[PDB]
Design a protein around this ligand. Structure first.
Ligand SMILES: C[N+](C)(C)CCO
Ligand SMILES: [Cl-]
Ligand code: NA
Length: 496
């Protein structure tokens, strides 16, 4: 029943992506800055960007007003270029966890690896879910098998590309994403089922208007989420790997700015596809009634629009664009997680080149399997894409601010900030993971599923409490050990 045309199309597109990169690696006027910016854009923009942005715009509860992850994650690159690019450079940093291990120690750096590893896993699960949904809709494959196949192909791509040389694969992949999406959009807009997306943005005919709305009581919560996506999107090894490998600090800053511009440009057609899905009379298409959000297939809105509103070859171009985005992001995500585990955890704390290569291969496999299980269990792409930066914002970002800008931080403040931020984040609950809150801040309300949500900005409160606890406990421990109030024999971490 499945169309073999789709399988042959994804095969030929994958080969077309890899062959040009192999040729460019075989071969290899002030244009390298553009190439670096395009490569960073291809690293940043994956299945999360495209599919999660379309889902967030499509879902009536969110709209464009609540599709904050594309804008926030693009602004993360601008903020990184402005403030974090120079302090991370000119030091012997290979990974993002190197400042943490150099200032707080190996154990605290390994502890800080856990939020980063969980964020990488959430991002990989979101992009695996996006690719599996695209394959399942367009090639008509079972969703579980499609997700497993996507994870397998991403794993083999990362491994095969790793040992050999790849040059300018990301440029060609970004070109494929851009062309596929921007040729899919005009075909989707001209479908007889799709109504005027300008009218649907401000008026409701099929569902609530896709521009979205923010209530006056929700404003703080909106701001809270935006901060989580704008500041929690900065401390990632996929970005700092390109920052540290640059020739100069100015080159790193300019590639950050160009990458942010490219991310916004890539986010535009995803917003348009989500708006088209929100403006579609599904009773007129072959998808039929019920509509995708009634079917609980909202997270699959972008492939559905590609499949049921576009011709078959345009659907194949869109599938190629999604595949290019997912491969170019999954390579960086898997490699960053594996490199951080191999260098910071295995090589530095516990301990050979062959041994390191082998543990990094098996780590790629285990990370892929964990992300596959997470992708199979969940039902949302935007939710995992959002949650990837949640614990990063809560935990790593205050510690990153402390190690870069706050002179005098130590391990006691790091541990205190870790515990305080984690406690305030956990006690606030998580609706995506169906967790009840223990602390009930003012404005709490139950959703459809019965989990109490928080209108109070408790995530930003947890982050700020983590930062202030780090500073206060660090200076208090320094004062207590310097003045002689606390005996020096109790300095378990030997920080001061
Ligand atoms: C999820 N990240 C923040 C790592 C990349 C944005 O797509
Ligand atoms: Cl993404
Ligand atoms: Na990508």
């Amino acid at each position: 029943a499945f169309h073999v045309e789709g399988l042959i199309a994804i095969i030929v597109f994958y080969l077309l992506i890899l062959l040009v990169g192999i040729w460019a690696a075989w071969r290899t006027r002030d244009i390298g800055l553009l190439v670096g910016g395009f490569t960073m854009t291809a690293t940043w923009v994956g299945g999360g960007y495209i599919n999660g942005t379309a889902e967030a715009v499509y879902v009536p509860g969110y709209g464009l007003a609540w599709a904050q992850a594309p804008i926030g994650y693009s602004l993360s690159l601008i903020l990184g270029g402005l403030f974090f690019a120079k302090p991370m450079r000119s030091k012997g940093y290979v990974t993002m966890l190197d400042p943490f291990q150099q200032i707080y120690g190996k154990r605290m750096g390994g502890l800080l690896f856990i939020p980063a590893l969980m964020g990488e896993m959430f991002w990989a699960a979101a992009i695996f879910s996006a690719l599996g949904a695209t394959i399942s809709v367009i090639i008509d494959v079972d969703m579980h098998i499609s997700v497993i196949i996507s994870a397998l192909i991403a794993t083999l791509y990362t491994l095969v590309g790793g040992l050999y040389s790849v040059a300018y694969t990301d440029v060609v992949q970004l070109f494929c994403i851009f062309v596929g999406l921007w040729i899919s959009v005009p075909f989707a807009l001209s479908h007889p089922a799709v109504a005027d997306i300008g009218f649907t943005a401000v008026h409701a005919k099929y569902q609530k208007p896709w521009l979205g709305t923010v209530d006056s009581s929700e404003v703080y919560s909106w701001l809270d989420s935006f901060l989580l996506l704008m500041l929690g999107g900065i401390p990632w090894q996929a970005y700092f790997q390109r920052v540290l490998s640059s020739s100069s600090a100015t080159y790193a800053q300019v590639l950050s700015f160009l990458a942010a511009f490219g991310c916004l440009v890539m986010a535009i057609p995803a917003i348009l596809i989500g708006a088209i899905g929100a403006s579609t009379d599904w009773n007129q298409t072959a998808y039929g009634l019920p509509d995708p959000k009634t079917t609980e297939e909202a997270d699959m809105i972008l492939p559905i629009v590609l499949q049921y509103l576009c011709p078959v070859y345009i659907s194949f171009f869109g599938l190629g664009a999604v595949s290019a985005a997912v491969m170019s992001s999954a390579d960086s995500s898997i490699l960053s997680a594996s490199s951080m585990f191999a260098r910071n955890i295995y090589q530095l704390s516990f301990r050979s080149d062959k041994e390191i290569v082998w543990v990094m291969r098996i780590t790629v496999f285990v990370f892929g399997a964990s992300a596959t299980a997470m992708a199979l269990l969940t039902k949302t792409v935007y939710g995992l894409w959002y949650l990837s930066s949640d614990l990063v914002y809560i935990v790593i970002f205050p510690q990153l601010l402390c190690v870069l800008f706050v002179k005098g931080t130590n391990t006691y403040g790091a541990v205190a900030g870790y515990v305080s931020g984690l406690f305030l984040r956990i006690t606030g609950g998580e609706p995506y993971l169906y967790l009840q809150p223990l602390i009930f801040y003012p404005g709490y309300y139950p959703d459809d599923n019965g989990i109490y949500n928080q209108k109070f900005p408790f995530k930003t409160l947890a982050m700020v409490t983590s930062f202030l606890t780090n500073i206060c406990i660090s200076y208090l421990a320094k004062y207590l050990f310097e003045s002689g109030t606390l005996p020096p024999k109790l300095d378990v971490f030997d920080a001061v």
